[PDB]
Amino acid sequence: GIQGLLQFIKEASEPIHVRKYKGQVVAVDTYCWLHKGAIACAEKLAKGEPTDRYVGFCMKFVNMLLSHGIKPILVFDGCTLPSKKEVERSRRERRQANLLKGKQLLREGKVSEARECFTRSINITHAMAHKVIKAARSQGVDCLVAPYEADAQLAYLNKAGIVQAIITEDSDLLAFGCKKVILKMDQFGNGLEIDQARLGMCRQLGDVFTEEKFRYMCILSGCDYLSSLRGIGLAKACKVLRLANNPDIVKVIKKIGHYLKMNITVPEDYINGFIRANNTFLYQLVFDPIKRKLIPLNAYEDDVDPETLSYAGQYVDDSIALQIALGNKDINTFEQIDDYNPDTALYF
DNA sequence: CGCTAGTCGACAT
DNA sequence: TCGACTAGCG
Ligand SMILES: [Mn+2]
Ligand SMILES: [Mn+2]
Ligand SMILES: [Mn+2]
Ligand SMILES: [Mn+2]
Ligand code: NA
Q1: Domain identity same for A270 and A289
Q2: DSSP H or E run through A176
Q3: CA A300 → C1' B8, Å?
């Protein structure tokens, strides 16, 4: 996510209860629940010892939403995004490192720290996610496996008007241009909501409350697709966008040092990386549940060439995309591991 | 002082 | 894929 974004725009936030959305549809970034539930059994997950606790943990929240008359759509991550491979590598390295370290501390004698290491080695696999999918489907809850990041999928579901709000712990969804996002929701329904249109309640943002400029700010501050320049965070990026009054962003990015009264040399590849990051936020592939078709998050504008956007996710056949979305197709082996059919009585 | 980057408990049961 | 907290910076 965008580090400290929630704190930066805290004025646009509002404490709520999910009963606000009774008789409505809400999409869920299920990974958060999955992780929080996986914490309660980190050791057994690390050792490979069998446990299905995260399932019950997620189903608690699901049953809560269902109890408050909410129609929940559980969304899951799919294939790895090429423009996110660095962060994936780092995360993986941290995971195996902390795993081995914990395994060592188990032999040393210190379990209190070994457990804490096992917490950092949490690896949420597609199998666990599929268990959760099984449970949710047994409780009549619609599930959707994103072709890539669940973030973009949720953003699409919200923009398309399929869902009214998004439940997540990740502030990336705001950069994607979600309308309504519910952060920090507990097991009872208490949560914090940020509306896009209410970003203007943040005086600190200045005139950076439009989707495009807000996105630019989030990218410049540092995201999962492009690391920020050293010494650059939300405040300075927002300052850059505030002080500058130019339509073309590239020139401003080239004058970032000028706008911040600093000596900031911008590498040539950083501009290209910014273009790539922007295009990743705008055009990352998602799955249209209605038309059952792979589409970019936003329709391609005239100023972009879709053939250069491989990093935003590659296209596959719509039937394969469908089988992935249903969770029937294994992400890694591309083999069919289930036979769920929505026609045999979200997908029309 | 304001802001960024990095650490470690919390996460949760 | 978190965030309070804070060393340590300009
Ligand atoms: Mn993120
Ligand atoms: Mn794929
Ligand atoms: Mn995500
Ligand atoms: Mn994200
Ligand atoms: Na940054």
Answers
A1: no
A2: none
A3: 44
